């Protein structure tokens, strides 16, 4: 808690590390949520929802 | 006074100076005096 909260505000290197970590985690979390809602909005329309997927003849 | 060593000075300066608000009073031909934001930015060093 207070250790990181005192390092981030007092040393720019720690703040820069915090920015990089936040970018990484936030971009992954939005990629994940945006794909979850995309999957929910398109039920049955996926390539792997094809019933005959695997029998061409 | 003797109890005030270099580490004490740095601790006190970090309490009172580092990234702190400042009050400015100026008079005369002061157009080249930098604005409040410049003074405020110069209270910390981003290289550290």
């Amino acid at each position: 808690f207070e250790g990181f909260y005192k390092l981030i505000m007092r040393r720019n290197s720690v703040y820069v590390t915090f920015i990089i970590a936040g970018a990484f985690f936030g971009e992954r979390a939005v990629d994940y949520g945006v794909h979850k809602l995309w999957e929910r909005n398109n039920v049955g329309k996926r390539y792997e929802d094809i019933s005959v997927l695997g029998q061409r003849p | 006074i003797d109890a005030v060593d270099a580490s004490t000075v740095k601790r006190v300066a970090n309490k009172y100076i580092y990234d702190k608000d400042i009050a400015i009073s100026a008079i005369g031909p002061i157009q080249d005096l930098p604005d409040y934001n410049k003074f405020r930015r110069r209270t910390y060093w981003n290289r550290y």
Partner: peptide, 28 residues
Amino acid sequence: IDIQAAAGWGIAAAAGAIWVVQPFGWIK
């Protein structure tokens, strides 16, 4: 303020390298 800063800026550089290049799988 010189060794601690060097360590901090090295940690930031390593984190930024892990963030730009994401070799999750090269931990072998």
